[PDB]
């Protein structure tokens, strides 16, 4: 079992569920259609947000195509929107691939940051490692039993 963690705005938590589309479900975090395990999300406004705002959080806006499910790597190279070749600094038809957040305590709901953890795993095909709590008993043999 492995867990994934990040901070996303509460207005887009619905995009986490499989089968959704949007800015973050296409360029940041795509979840496969067949999914086991589940996700836990809750509001984190007392800790993450700042009175003057928080700007250290980034999110991708522009990508050449929708990314395959479960992509983690990121490249900060310059993006060109129009057909004009673009190098050095951005500008006309050249947009920076990422953008920041802004979190104020004065913001209403749907804008305060949220902390999200995602769980996923496969079911009983290989020798299991993570197991639940239950007592182990003796191994009886050659008798009608319920194993």
């Amino acid at each position, epitope marked *: 079992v492995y867990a994934d963690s990040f901070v996303i705005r509460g207005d887009e938590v619905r995009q986490i569920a499989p089968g959704q589309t949007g800015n973050i479900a296409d360029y940041n975090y795509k979840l496969p259609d067949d999914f086991t395990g589940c996700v836990i999300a809750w509001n984190s*406004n*007392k*800790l993450d*947000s*700042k*009175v*003057s705002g928080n700007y250290n959080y980034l999110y991708r806006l522009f990508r050449k195509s929708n990314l395959k499910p479960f992509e983690r790597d990121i490249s900060t190279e310059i993006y060109q929107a129009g057909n004009k070749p673009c190098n050095g600094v951005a500008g006309f038809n050249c947009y920076f691939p990422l953008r920041s957040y802004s979190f104020r*305590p*004065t*913001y*209403g709901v749907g804008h305060q940051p949220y902390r999200v953890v995602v769980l996923s795993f496969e079911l009983l095909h290989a020798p299991a490692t993570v197991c639940g709590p239950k007592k182990s008993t003796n191994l009886v043999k050659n008798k009608c039993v319920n194993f």
Partner: antibody
Amino acid sequence: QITLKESGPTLVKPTQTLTLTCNFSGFSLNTYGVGVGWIRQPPGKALEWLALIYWDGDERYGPFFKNKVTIAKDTSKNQVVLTMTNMDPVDTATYYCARHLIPTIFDYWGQGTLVTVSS
Amino acid sequence: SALTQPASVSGSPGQSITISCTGTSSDVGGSNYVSWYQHHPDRAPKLLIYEVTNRPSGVSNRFSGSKSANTASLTISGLQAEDEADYYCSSYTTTSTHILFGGGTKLTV
């Protein structure tokens, strides 16, 4: 437990600049989520917020006193230093240094020091 | 600034009396974060309200608060000699992180 202590000169010449220190003792300021700010109250009137600094080196000053004040922190000796410039007789006030949190705006205040302007 | 508060309120010991801090709804915003501090002379003020009708550890159950449309009201029950002090309102604002409230002194006899 945390004590906020203010130290600095009380009498200042208007042409001269002012420096002040708050030697907080009892929290590590580096903890994620805690800030510290400065509040002054001139005699006869209400208080007045000056500025505040965050744990991760994020600084917020007053809308009017951006150039007048400068803030810095030293977690090794657990101190914060504030610099005020071209003060006025109206600016004479009692100064406090205070812990700042998001849910509880301001919780614990230092005892403060009086500041007056004369020759 | 653009925020106000009545300064003086009077009452009688043993009864209940209230004061309010008032401003403009636009500056404070939809989210309130109403807070109230007390200050007797000769030592630093401390916090008695940090959230809507909420009081931290070191409680004094006689304290109470209530956030109206554009005001925050502080109410005291069973008055004694400790009321003769100045009580400050404090709320988050939008354009600046200011409170700038005069504070409320209390009278009793």
